[PDB]
Amino acid sequence: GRTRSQQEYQQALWYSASAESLALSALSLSLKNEKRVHLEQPWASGPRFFPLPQGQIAVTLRDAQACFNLNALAQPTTASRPLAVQQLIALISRLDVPAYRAELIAESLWEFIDEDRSVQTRLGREDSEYLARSVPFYAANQPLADISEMRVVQGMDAGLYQKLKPLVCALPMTRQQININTLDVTQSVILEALFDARALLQQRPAKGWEDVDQFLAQPLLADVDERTKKQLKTVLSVDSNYFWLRSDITVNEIELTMNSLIVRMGPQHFSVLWHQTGES
Amino acid sequence: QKLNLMQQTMSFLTHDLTQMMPRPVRGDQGQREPALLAGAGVLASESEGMRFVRGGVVNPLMRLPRSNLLTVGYRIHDGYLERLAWPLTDAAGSVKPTMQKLIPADSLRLQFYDGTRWQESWSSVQAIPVAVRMTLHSPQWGEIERIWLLRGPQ
Amino acid sequence: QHVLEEKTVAGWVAENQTALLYLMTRGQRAVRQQGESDMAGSRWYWRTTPLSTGNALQAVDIEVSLHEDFSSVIQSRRAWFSA
Ligand SMILES: [Ca+2]
Ligand SMILES: [Ca+2]
Ligand SMILES: [Ca+2]
Ligand SMILES: [Cl-]
């Protein structure tokens, strides 16, 4: 009996490799001659379903850069509180978290991700925090590999983790390059954070903005100050190099969800960086 | 039974290897160590050994302060393939791994596919292979070779 | 038990050759391949045959037999690739 299942689960992983192969295909084809990443492009229509013997696959692609990249905190800085830290405190505040706790978490994240082992924040802590735990461990002191690594920082819980999850990510870049064309209207608190309004995204053009300058100089952003615009210009984008694939695979009674992070390697070349079984 | 243990073994291996993460780690004292550590004597293996990070822990309530990643390893010890598992990453040296005696086995050899060629050693700090070839000799079965993709198509 | 062990070992060959298809190019996957793999003290013949798909996405069947002429296929696999 176990020979069949093991063969079938193996076959469930191969269908996941099939799912991924299709994703890379769709991405290359829809983005080959395109200079931007927006929601009227073919990759963004989903989900797609394909039959398999004794099952099926369902695939949906999303822009991985449609979120606040926490690894912007890995960026070499030399100011007492960098911009990514300011913006994350503003973001967290907006999830029903008091000013203090929002600061604790953001500063804790900064220290967890920054490569040094020394403290430079009022509330953040390095190895001692983490060696003190029920199961003791060291502070990563590097970019997060997975958004789940944030669960362990000071001042975090399940409720907030799940509130924060749809809005923040862990990409393998230290830049903040948020693709304004692919942000969902539901992720509009990000913009609230970055502007110190679902209206902006609700009224986004069908094929997105041609560039960030066009975004920033629309009537709706008249009264925002120039400094906020100059720094928003360093963190926003109309393009992306990272995508999430969700594949839901069924073989007989076996149901498997796979999340895959895809990187754009060339104009017609996309690759899978890593993948993991995910929650339904 | 001989079959069950082998099926078990292949299951553990497939679940671990196919969800490997390109994540460097801190060792028993906090020293920087590579994402994939592999080669002769890794984890005091009597043959080749390997040690890496993998994801895929499903814990949707996220109730304890823990991520969805684990550190795992394989080695030959006392004439057995053995699986070592730490319950989290960057663990303190006080944190001891579980040990799972798998199939009798006496030599574990590893090759690594970098996207272009098969190579015998792995030395990158951050990067992980596209595929791994494992060979071992089992007294129950003889020589077994298995190829795993670590992260799908490229 | 013997047949379960046989399918299990033939299954490894099939898995191994499916993985290798994902390392090859589109053009290589488009043409039939075959060979021989010695595994657990027996010799297993494998071959990979393209099938025509719906989506403009490749497919391939992977077959494993104890026989050089591929009579009596112990394990088959199907896999999809990008075109
Ligand atoms: Ca620090
Ligand atoms: Ca640090
Ligand atoms: Ca062999
Ligand atoms: Cl083989």
Swiss-Prot record, chain C:
Keywords, ordered alphabetically: Cell inner membrane, Cell membrane, Membrane, Methylation, Transmembrane, Transmembrane helix
Record membrane topology: Single-pass membrane protein
GO process annotations (BP): protein secretion by the type II secretion system
Predominant localisation class: membrane
Cellular component aspect of the GO annotation: plasma membrane; type II protein secretion system complex
Post-translational modification: Cleaved by prepilin peptidase.
Subcellular location: Cell inner membrane
Function description: Component of the type II secretion system required for the energy-dependent secretion of extracellular factors such as proteases and toxins from the periplasm. Part of the pseudopilus tip complex that is critical for the recognition and binding of secretion substrates.
Similarity comment text for this entry: Belongs to the GSP I family.
Quaternary structure note: Type II secretion is composed of four main components: the outer membrane complex, the inner membrane complex, the cytoplasmic secretion ATPase and the periplasm-spanning pseudopilus. Interacts with core component GspG. Interacts with pseudopilins GspJ and GspK.
Protein name: Type II secretion system protein I
Taxonomic source organism: Escherichia coli
Full-sequence range covered: 35 to 118 of 123
